Amino acid sequence: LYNKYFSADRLHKAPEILFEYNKTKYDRVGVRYTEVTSKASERFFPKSRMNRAPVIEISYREGAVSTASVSLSMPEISGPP
Amino acid sequence: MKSVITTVVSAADAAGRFPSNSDLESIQGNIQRSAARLEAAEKLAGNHEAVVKEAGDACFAKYAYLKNPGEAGENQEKINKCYRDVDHYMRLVNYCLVVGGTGPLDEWGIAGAREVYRTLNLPTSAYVASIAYTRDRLCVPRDMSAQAGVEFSAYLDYLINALS
Amino acid sequence: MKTPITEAIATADNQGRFLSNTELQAVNGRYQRATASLTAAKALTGSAQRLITGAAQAVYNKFPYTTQMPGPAYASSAIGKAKCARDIGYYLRMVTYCLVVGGTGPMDEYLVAGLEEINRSFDLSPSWYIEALQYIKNSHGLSGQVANEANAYIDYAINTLS
Amino acid sequence: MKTPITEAIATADNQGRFLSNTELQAVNGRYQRATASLTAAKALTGSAQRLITGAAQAVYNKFPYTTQMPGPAYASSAIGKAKCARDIGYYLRMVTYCLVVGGTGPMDEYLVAGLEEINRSFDLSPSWYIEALQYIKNSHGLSGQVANEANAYIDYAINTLS
Amino acid sequence: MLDAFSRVVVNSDAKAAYVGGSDLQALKSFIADGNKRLDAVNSIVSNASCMVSDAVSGMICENPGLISPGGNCYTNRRMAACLRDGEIILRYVSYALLAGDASVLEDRCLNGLKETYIALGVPTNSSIRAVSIMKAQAVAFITNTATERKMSFAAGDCTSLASEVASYFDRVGAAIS
Amino acid sequence: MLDAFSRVVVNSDAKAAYVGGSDLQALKSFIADGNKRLDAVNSIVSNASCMVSDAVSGMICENPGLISPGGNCYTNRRMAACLRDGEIILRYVSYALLAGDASVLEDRCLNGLKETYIALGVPTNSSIRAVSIMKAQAVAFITNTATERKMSFAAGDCTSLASEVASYFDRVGAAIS
Amino acid sequence: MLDAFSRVVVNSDAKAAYVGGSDLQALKSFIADGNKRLDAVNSIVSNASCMVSDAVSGMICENPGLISPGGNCYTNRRMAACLRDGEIILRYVSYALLAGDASVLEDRCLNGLKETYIALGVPTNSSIRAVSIMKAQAVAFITNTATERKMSFAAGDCTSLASEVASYFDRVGAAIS
Amino acid sequence: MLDAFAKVVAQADARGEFLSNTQIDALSKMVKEGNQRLDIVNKVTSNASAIVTNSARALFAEQPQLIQPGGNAYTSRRMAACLRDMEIVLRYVSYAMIAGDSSVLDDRCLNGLRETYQALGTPGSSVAVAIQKMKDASVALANDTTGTPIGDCSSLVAELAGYFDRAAVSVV
Amino acid sequence: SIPILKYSLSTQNQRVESFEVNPGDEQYRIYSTDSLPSSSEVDQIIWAAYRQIFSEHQILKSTKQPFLESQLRFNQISIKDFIKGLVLSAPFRDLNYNVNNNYRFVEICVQRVLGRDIYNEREKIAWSIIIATQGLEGFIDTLLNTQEYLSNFGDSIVPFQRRRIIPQRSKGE
Numbered sequence A: 001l002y003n004k005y006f007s008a009d010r011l012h013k014a015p016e017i018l019f020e021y022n023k024t025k026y027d028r029v030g031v032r033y034t035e036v037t038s039k040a041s042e043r044f045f046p047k048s049r050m051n052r053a054p055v056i057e058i059s060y061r062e063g064a065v066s067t068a069s070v071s072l073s074m075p076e077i078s079g080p081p
Numbered sequence B: 001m002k003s004v005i006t007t008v009v010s011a012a013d014a015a016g017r018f019p020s021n022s023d024l025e026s027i028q029g030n031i032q033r034s035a036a037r038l039e040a041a042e043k044l045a046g047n048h049e050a051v052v053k054e055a056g057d058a059c060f061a062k063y064a065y066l067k068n069p070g071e072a073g074e075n076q077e078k079i080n081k082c083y084r085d086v087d088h089y090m091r092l093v094n095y096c097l098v099v100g101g102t103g104p105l106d107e108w109g110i111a112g113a114r115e116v117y118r119t120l121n122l123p124t125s126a127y128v129a130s131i132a133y134t135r136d137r138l139c140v141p142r143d144m145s146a147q148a149g150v151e152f153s154a155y156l157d158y159l160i161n162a163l164s
Numbered sequence C, D: 001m002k003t004p005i006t007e008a009i010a011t012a013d014n015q016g017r018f019l020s021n022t023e024l025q026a027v028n029g030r031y032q033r034a035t036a037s038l039t040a041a042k043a044l045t046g047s048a049q050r051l052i053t054g055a056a057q058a059v060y061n062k063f064p065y066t067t068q069m070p071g072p073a074y075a076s077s078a079i080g081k082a083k084c085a086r087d088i089g090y091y092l093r094m095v096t097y098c099l100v101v102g103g104t105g106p107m108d109e110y111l112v113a114g115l116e117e118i119n120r121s122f123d124l125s126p127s128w129y130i131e132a133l134q135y136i137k138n139s140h141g142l143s144g145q146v147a148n149e150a151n152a153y154i155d156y157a158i159n160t161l162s
Numbered sequence E, F, G: 001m002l003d004a005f006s007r008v009v010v011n012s013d014a015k016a017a018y019v020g021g022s023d024l025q026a027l028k029s030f031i032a033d034g035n036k037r038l039d040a041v042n043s044i045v046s047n048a049s050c051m052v053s054d055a056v057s058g059m060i061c062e063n064p065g066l067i068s069p070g071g072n073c074y075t076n077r078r079m080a081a082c083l084r085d086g087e088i089i090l091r092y093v094s095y096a097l098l099a100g101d102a103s104v105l106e107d108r109c110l111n112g113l114k115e116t117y118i119a120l121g122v123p124t125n126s127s128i129r130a131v132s133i134m135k136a137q138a139v140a141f142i143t144n145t146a147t148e149r150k151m152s153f154a155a156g157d158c159t160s161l162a163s164e165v166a167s168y169f170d171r172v173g174a175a176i177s
Numbered sequence H: 001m002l003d004a005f006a007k008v009v010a011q012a013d014a015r016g017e018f019l020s021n022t023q024i025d026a027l028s029k030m031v032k033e034g035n036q037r038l039d040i041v042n043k044v045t046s047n048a049s050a051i052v053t054n055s056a057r058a059l060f061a062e063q064p065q066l067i068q069p070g071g072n073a074y075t076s077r078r079m080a081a082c083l084r085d086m087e088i089v090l091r092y093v094s095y096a097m098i099a100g101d102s103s104v105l106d107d108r109c110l111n112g113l114r115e116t117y118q119a120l121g122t123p124g125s126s127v128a129v130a131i132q133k134m135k136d137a138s139v140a141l142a143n144d145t146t147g148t149p150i151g152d153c154s155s156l157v158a159e160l161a162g163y164f165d166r167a168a169v170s171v172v
Numbered sequence I: 001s002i003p004i005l006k007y008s009l010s011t012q013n014q015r016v017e018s019f020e021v022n023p024g025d026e027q028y029r030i031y032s033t034d035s036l037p038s039s040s041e042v043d044q045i046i047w048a049a050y051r052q053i054f055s056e057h058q059i060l061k062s063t064k065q066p067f068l069e070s071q072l073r074f075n076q077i078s079i080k081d082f083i084k085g086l087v088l089s090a091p092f093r094d095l096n097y098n099v100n101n102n103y104r105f106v107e108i109c110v111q112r113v114l115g116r117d118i119y120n121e122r123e124k125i126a127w128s129i130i131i132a133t134q135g136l137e138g139f140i141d142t143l144l145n146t147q148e149y150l151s152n153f154g155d156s157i158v159p160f161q162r163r164r165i166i167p168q169r170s171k172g173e
């Protein structure tokens, strides 16, 4: 029983801080309230990092080494059926 | 000779008028471009015994069937003719790098080429292979400057579109 | 092709009046429902081949005389199954288009128009496609508001087919 | 009388199609703006006599000849001031009605239809009512998402008057 | 302007509020060393999820008895609740840094938390170990001495951020005690 | 060039790095046999989607119990997530080949994955079968002995690539075990 | 024909107004990005031949009724006339991109093309397809995102120029529609 | 008609495959500026008469020969004929603004307007000047924030000017 | 397809011929644009079309259709297309259509479009249906393709009430 301090209407609720900052005249900061949500797997796969995988793209044509390039990112990716 | 000066002079002569501002500004652009344009021409003059040599064997590397009997490269003298005709095209590219426009190519290399290469049964794509091999061999910070390289490949690309 | 933006234009153009607040709220509601429709369209795109093969198998189970009757209209031979999977792919594609634009406009001009004489002259029964759509409506795996947005365009086609 | 619900009905009735959520989003956006329009209508109701007398005094200040000119069209006598306050009360009433239903439908059928020959035959100048409405548009007190909803119907009438 | 931030929490309505221009200039004028404080709270909110994950894995790889059957982290849904709790504590201490004041840290999370964990049978010293791990990660992110992670800042010293959040994490660790 | 690629992984920011000819020559000067180490990762990224599809269909046509009701691949959600997981593992092992080093393969996917699959009830041996199928497809694509698929390469031997990715796939298959 | 300059002169001549500093700034901005404009027309006309060849063959390979007997692209003569029909519109689009105005495009090429095509019996749909596939190659060559060929440039983006050449390519598709 | 959403559906269906995953967030950014697009349009709608009348008064202040006896816009029917044309091109620009693409503007307004002006003898390049006189009055009015939260609308007013030049060059 | 319900006819003035070569007074000044009108006779045609369908107060400024007139003055549309682009106008839809049922609506535009009074009520029963299933526009497109419209008004004569006054009589209806 925990209802004396943490009643069920405000249970598991925290502020969140957001930043619209790009060194711009329109740069903002925001504060909101939220219900928090987390699940089990985030001891090793944290929410900012979860399900992100490094994709590599290459442009090359045979003999065109001066045009060849490579790039790297890691977005959110899903499986194609 | 299609160049910057001949264009505006022929336009003023067809109109029967004196040279105005629009003709002199075009010569100003030639003045402003000659520094980057003549940079590629002197290095093509200094490197040509290597560049047509190592561009000619790329043609036979892509098309090894040309050295078969009954083809256009059956003996050594026809291969010497092939390196001859490659060096001629490189000399014409060096010429249009000097003039400013594409006068020497469409006067001496391009006009009438489709008749000769058809009746003498020379494969047209084998020329485009040797030109396109030298087009992407150019790395821009090392051989030329950044501005000489684009103005060198634009004539090479022009030849490719004319032959294809 | 009619989306909620297009009738907002079409009403103001009737007297040629300027766009007031009576039309801007109508497009604002499209912008409200746009998120719940777009993930429905994305999830239906991700589930295309599974739903198409399951729907075709549901029609073959519920109407077994379809793959056994000798005739060009039936799926008894191998190419009839290709035509039958092609049709269900067309239906699911129109459903995803209507989910994207937020209105029944795509299927109203690509499928609905002249779908009566197509079923009548080529002797196709409309009751097959209702079974195909009733398979998709319950087994697409979405739930809640996204599924409620997705089911409306699905059983809209059930309504015009019946 | 057009509100965003009425064109949602009128578009579906043209082919006689059922109400899919092409139009349900259009009425959902009305339900979104409804709260911000209703408190604007309530606050404009609460400020009726102050705004009417201030607007009439603004017209009498900006056009002092209307207080002096001998004629039936002017407010030089006592009953002309009663007609002039009655007209501004009519305008504010139509503004509150359009704020309530969420569309310009009330004033479109009660006010502006046939207003041209009213101003022409009875020799009233439309520039008086623009000053009366420009008084209400800045000195109503409303500010924010509620004043932006209230100002649109106010300067809509400025647009048709001019 | 900080009263507008407090208003949100007072109302608990989950509707966002934003400051910029003259309102953000008033906030940065009012609360001490604002620019540095902003790089500070950015260095927390961009690293928060890895912080609670690394913290609870450090607690578990120190004491396996919670992951044993009969442990408080066993039957993973509770372990999800523990991840949630650690992240909530992180969010409140990040706000308390951003405010330069520890009042809401008392009033909204630390008020009556110890008795709650006693009533639930939550072991205290493991959570003290967890918040000390978060304190070390926070001061590492604030000195830009993360061995694994790099952000570019305008050059200078930020003594207050490490001592400020160390005082705040010690307030949490003493209030749970 | 190398520092930017490292910072993309360290930040996890999902923004693409991009490189010029002088940049590419610097990374190729750092890398061992970069020229040949590039045809390899190209032969993976041009074949990746068919690889995970053929892998999961080979697992399913070996063990149908996952597609039976009560199976882990049954339901609309399970099939989509398992395809996603297998492709993620493929992308990380492709990076680990491109780097010539298996550190991020540990740190970003293999760290704590087995306990996650235990907590979700994912059967391990089926995923081991899957990654062995991907290992066979990878070494087939690297010897250019794909019976169905052809790319032209500059002529020569690339034995190290077959052994490099076999060591990496065995690292995955042992770390999940 | 007019230009990025003669356009504002014909606009100012209706006013009988001098070209003052208010509307000269668009012309100075047009001059200040002239090097990117020349860098774009060079990139288009260097690959112009493969553009028309790939465009007409891509129009054919998704509508094989044109090369069907009696189709509009059936014999060698009709196919050569189509391959030149496309080259002419690419030439006039390049003129309009160099001049910065579509006035050379609309009267020298588009004035009367519609009734020409429906006097010849040319299908409109394949012409919009061949125009759209050329627009897709032009926007790839200007922004240097062409897959099979990359050209070297300076740093900066040309979405300006890409949308200008896209509007030029939609003008012809609207004219022959 | 075509709006900005059906545009992406059109060439996706003409290519024949589904919408890709990077186009859906290109549409979810497009719904992100929605509230901003409504503030813009509503700005140009509420003072639509004042834009037309001030642009016409500035148009005749520099070109009297239009109001000259014998000029094109001289008689009261011919003077009224300018104001309706200016309100039409203001109206279809505001249609294209909320639509997100230019396809409805050149469809019902700019299609063949050059041929009508070349047939009536209405000269070509003051309707261009009138459209430019309306353009600067519109994008100055879209900049006003008085009655809206503070932010960036400049990408959308670039598009709003990107409709007016399209209207201004299909009439010369 | 549910064709039109068969109703049966009556006897009227316009049903039988007039024998009236050279009439003078009971003729309603046919406003055709085959007349090739000038710039101000077009205004007379437009006003007479407004009087025919609308009554004389749906010639307010509010009810005016200023762009339909601009397509008439450029010969984009004809008179018949102008007529039921005027019936499709929503001032006609809220002033005349929202205030009566569809039986009275059938008679309120058979008289204004076809120029004749209804045969019986069974005709109003048979024509009330095209308002319901395919709407107002589906009603008027099927009304203006009848032989009753095309054989006397064609596509460039403004419609009018037909054979209202008998020649020797003064009164008529």
Ligand SMILES: *CC[C@H]1/C(=C/c2[nH]c(/C=C3N=C(/C=C4\NC(=O)C(CC)=C4C)C(C)=C\3CCC(=O)O)c(CCC(=O)O)c2C)NC(=O)[C@@H]1C
Residues within 6 Å of the ligand: C056, C059, C066, C067, C072, C073, C074, C075, C076, C079, C080, C081, C083, C084, C085, C087, C088, C090, C091, C110, C111, C118, C122, C124, C128, C132
């Ligand atoms: C579930 C499969 C059932 C079935 C299918 C079947 N269909 C056809 C032939 C046609 N179906 C259509 C329908 C459409 N075409 C479209 O493009 C669209 C969307 C715009 C629809 C709804 C048409 C036009 C045809 C004829 C042309 C064709 O597509 O082949 C056939 C072949 C019939 C024939 O060849 O005469 C089959 C077998 N029939 C079944 O038995 C299944 C239950």
Ligand SMILES: *CC[C@H]1/C(=C/c2[nH]c(/C=C3N=C(/C=C4\NC(=O)C(CC)=C4C)C(C)=C\3CCC(=O)O)c(CCC(=O)O)c2C)NC(=O)[C@@H]1C
Residues within 6 Å of the ligand: D056, D059, D066, D072, D073, D074, D075, D076, D079, D080, D081, D083, D084, D085, D087, D088, D090, D091, D110, D111, D118, D122, D124, D128, D132
């Ligand atoms: C601000 C007062 C100015 C003014 C007013 C004035 N008005 C009238 C007469 C009329 N005004 C109307 C207008 C309306 N009547 C309505 O019912 C509505 C809403 C649906 C409007 C907009 C009408 C119809 C009349 C004539 C009948 C009447 O209301 O009396 C008069 C009297 C004119 C006369 O009697 O001939 C005045 C003085 N005039 C001013 O000088 C003030 C500036």
Ligand SMILES: C=CC1=C(C)[C@@H](Cc2[nH]c(/C=C3N=C(/C=C4\NC(=O)[C@H](C)[C@H]4CC)C(C)=C\3CCC(=O)O)c(CCC(=O)O)c2C)NC1=O
Residues within 6 Å of the ligand: B056, B059, B066, B072, B073, B078, B079, B081, B082, B083, B084, B085, B086, B088, B089, B108, B109, B116, B120, B122, B123, B124, B126, B127, B130
């Ligand atoms: C001034 C301008 C100028 C040119 C552009 C060239 C073009 C050119 N090449 C050849 C002539 C030739 N060109 C080739 C070339 C080739 N055969 C191949 O297999 C390849 C396609 C290619 C080598 C790479 C050969 C083999 C001949 C001799 C043809 C023969 O008679 O067998 C000829 C005929 C005259 C001759 O015998 O040399 C000409 C005009 N020569 C010029 O004077």
Ligand SMILES: C=CC1=C(C)[C@@H](Cc2[nH]c(/C=C3N=C(/C=C4\NC(=O)[C@H](C)[C@H]4CC)C(C)=C\3CCC(=O)O)c(CCC(=O)O)c2C)NC1=O
Residues within 6 Å of the ligand: A065, A066, B043, B044, B047, B050, B051, B054, B137, B138, B139, B140, B142, B143, B144
């Ligand atoms: C007129 C212009 C002109 C050129 C373009 C080059 C073309 C060229 N390159 C090389 C020879 C070479 N050329 C390069 C240059 C490059 N190799 C690459 O992989 C990069 C893409 C590119 C720029 C860095 C290198 C690195 C060598 C030595 C190894 C090799 O042949 O690739 C040679 C042999 C003789 C020599 O070294 O010069 C020639 C003719 N030379 C010229 O005179």
Ligand SMILES: C=CC1=C(C)[C@@H](Cc2[nH]c(/C=C3N=C(/C=C4\NC(=O)[C@H](C)[C@H]4CC)C(C)=C\3CCC(=O)O)c(CCC(=O)O)c2C)NC1=O
Residues within 6 Å of the ligand: E047, E050, E051, E054, E055, E057, E058, E059, E060, E061, E062, E132, E133, E136, E137, E140, E141, E145, E146, E147, E148, E149
């Ligand atoms: C056996 C179990 C076991 C673990 C799970 C780890 C957990 C762990 N991490 C750190 C320590 C730390 N943890 C982080 C956190 C991060 N670093 C980053 O770059 C990411 C952004 C973020 C999530 C990974 C930081 C920045 C430090 C301080 C620098 C360091 O020691 O690496 C500490 C020391 C804290 C202290 O007491 O001072 C511990 C115990 N260590 C262990 O012994």
Ligand SMILES: C=CC1=C(C)[C@@H](Cc2[nH]c(/C=C3N=C(/C=C4\NC(=O)[C@H](C)[C@H]4CC)C(C)=C\3CCC(=O)O)c(CCC(=O)O)c2C)NC1=O
Residues within 6 Å of the ligand: A002, A006, A010, A011, A012, A013, E056, E066, E072, E073, E078, E079, E081, E082, E083, E085, E086, E088, E089, E108, E109, E113, E116, E120, E122, E123, E126, E127, E130
């Ligand atoms: C405003 C601030 C605020 C908080 C901090 C949390 C505090 C909090 N945590 C729990 C509840 C819990 N908290 C934990 C957490 C832990 N157990 C451990 O062994 C670890 C030390 C630690 C995680 C690292 C667990 C495991 C439960 C669930 C206990 C149970 O199953 O009953 C509860 C009871 C309600 C519930 O069961 O969800 C509350 C009020 N809630 C709040 O509203």
Ligand SMILES: C=CC1=C(C)[C@@H](Cc2[nH]c(/C=C3N=C(/C=C4\NC(=O)[C@H](C)[C@H]4CC)C(C)=C\3CCC(=O)O)c(CCC(=O)O)c2C)NC1=O
Residues within 6 Å of the ligand: A019, A021, A027, A028, A029, E035, E036, E037, E038, E039, E040, E042, E142, E143, E144, E153, E154, E155, E156, E157, E158, E161
């Ligand atoms: C809304 C978002 C927002 C931010 C994130 C900050 C970002 C920010 N930081 C500083 C500027 C600075 N930021 C720091 C802070 C630090 N420097 C370090 O090396 C330490 C790691 C860290 C201490 C915590 C320092 C020391 C300066 C320069 C002095 C100062 O302005 O405070 C400046 C002014 C100069 C500049 O542009 O760089 C700005 C805009 N400000 C904002 O408005």
Ligand SMILES: C=CC1=C(C)[C@@H](Cc2[nH]c(/C=C3N=C(/C=C4\NC(=O)[C@H](C)[C@H]4CC)C(C)=C\3CCC(=O)O)c(CCC(=O)O)c2C)NC1=O
Residues within 6 Å of the ligand: F047, F050, F051, F054, F055, F057, F058, F059, F060, F061, F062, F132, F133, F136, F137, F140, F141, F145, F146, F147, F148, F149
């Ligand atoms: C009953 C279920 C069942 C399947 C679904 C397939 C699945 C499958 N494919 C391969 C084996 C392979 N799979 C591929 C993959 C591909 N080949 C290509 O050319 C494409 C580009 C790409 C996607 C199709 C390759 C290259 C091989 C190795 C060569 C081969 O055996 O065909 C293997 C053997 C791997 C091993 O254990 O060594 C299996 C089980 N086989 C089955 O028994």
Ligand SMILES: C=CC1=C(C)[C@@H](Cc2[nH]c(/C=C3N=C(/C=C4\NC(=O)[C@H](C)[C@H]4CC)C(C)=C\3CCC(=O)O)c(CCC(=O)O)c2C)NC1=O
Residues within 6 Å of the ligand: A041, A045, A049, A050, A051, A052, F056, F066, F072, F073, F077, F078, F079, F081, F082, F083, F085, F086, F088, F089, F108, F109, F113, F116, F120, F122, F123, F126, F127, F130
């Ligand atoms: C950085 C690396 C990284 C990964 C590899 C994945 C790992 C991973 N997979 C799942 C989650 C899952 N993973 C699978 C996968 C499988 N089940 C099987 O039976 C097959 C063996 C296998 C597919 C071939 C399934 C079916 C789920 C969903 C389980 C569920 O429904 O709860 C989860 C839990 C979160 C979720 O449910 O989405 C995580 C963390 N995520 C990551 O962040």
Ligand SMILES: C=CC1=C(C)[C@@H](Cc2[nH]c(/C=C3N=C(/C=C4\NC(=O)[C@H](C)[C@H]4CC)C(C)=C\3CCC(=O)O)c(CCC(=O)O)c2C)NC1=O
Residues within 6 Å of the ligand: A058, A059, A060, A062, A063, A065, A068, A069, A070, F033, F034, F035, F036, F037, F038, F039, F040, F042, F142, F143, F144, F153, F154, F155, F156, F157, F158, F161
């Ligand atoms: C950015 C993109 C990019 C690439 C994809 C590669 C493409 C590439 N590969 C090689 C060159 C080569 N590539 C290979 C590799 C192989 N050969 C085989 O037959 C095996 C199947 C495979 C082993 C994995 C070999 C053996 C060479 C020649 C020796 C070498 O340069 O390594 C070369 C130099 C010579 C040439 O131009 O061909 C280039 C540019 N390099 C790049 O810069």
Ligand SMILES: C=CC1=C(C)[C@@H](Cc2[nH]c(/C=C3N=C(/C=C4\NC(=O)[C@H](C)[C@H]4CC)C(C)=C\3CCC(=O)O)c(CCC(=O)O)c2C)NC1=O
Residues within 6 Å of the ligand: G056, G066, G072, G073, G077, G078, G079, G081, G082, G083, G085, G086, G088, G089, G108, G109, G113, G116, G120, G122, G123, G126, G127, G130
């Ligand atoms: C100044 C601008 C200018 C142009 C744009 C062209 C326009 C043009 N094209 C053709 C003529 C043609 N154009 C095409 C082209 C096509 N038909 C198709 O099915 C495809 C869609 C498309 C090729 C991609 C064909 C097939 C003919 C007629 C060939 C014939 O009938 O013999 C003709 C008639 C002349 C003739 O046929 O000989 C003209 C004037 N010419 C010009 O002077």
Ligand SMILES: C=CC1=C(C)[C@@H](Cc2[nH]c(/C=C3N=C(/C=C4\NC(=O)[C@H](C)[C@H]4CC)C(C)=C\3CCC(=O)O)c(CCC(=O)O)c2C)NC1=O
Residues within 6 Å of the ligand: G047, G050, G051, G054, G055, G057, G058, G060, G061, G062, G132, G133, G136, G137, G140, G141, G145, G146, G147, G148, G149
């Ligand atoms: C059915 C038959 C069929 C084809 C023939 C090709 C034709 C083709 N090419 C491209 C698309 C393209 N085509 C080119 C053209 C070229 N690239 C170069 O660098 C060369 C210089 C030049 C000749 C090869 C370019 C640059 C693109 C843009 C994307 C790309 O680089 O491929 C597109 C996409 C157009 C669009 O997205 O709207 C199509 C359909 N594809 C097909 O499906």
Ligand SMILES: C=CC1=C(C)[C@@H](Cc2[nH]c(/C=C3N=C(/C=C4\NC(=O)[C@H](C)[C@H]4CC)C(C)=C\3CCC(=O)O)c(CCC(=O)O)c2C)NC1=O
Residues within 6 Å of the ligand: B033, B146, B147, B150, G032, G033, G035, G036, G038, G039, G040, G042, G142, G143, G144, G153, G154, G155, G156, G157, G158, G159
């Ligand atoms: C007569 C021949 C002639 C040309 C061929 C061009 C060649 C050229 N391009 C640029 C210069 C440039 N060119 C581009 C254009 C681009 N950069 C990209 O990465 C995109 C692919 C593309 C469209 C954005 C840009 C962004 C600059 C630098 C900006 C500038 O110089 O104004 C410059 C000026 C800087 C320099 O000297 O390098 C020159 C001379 N100009 C000419 O006078």
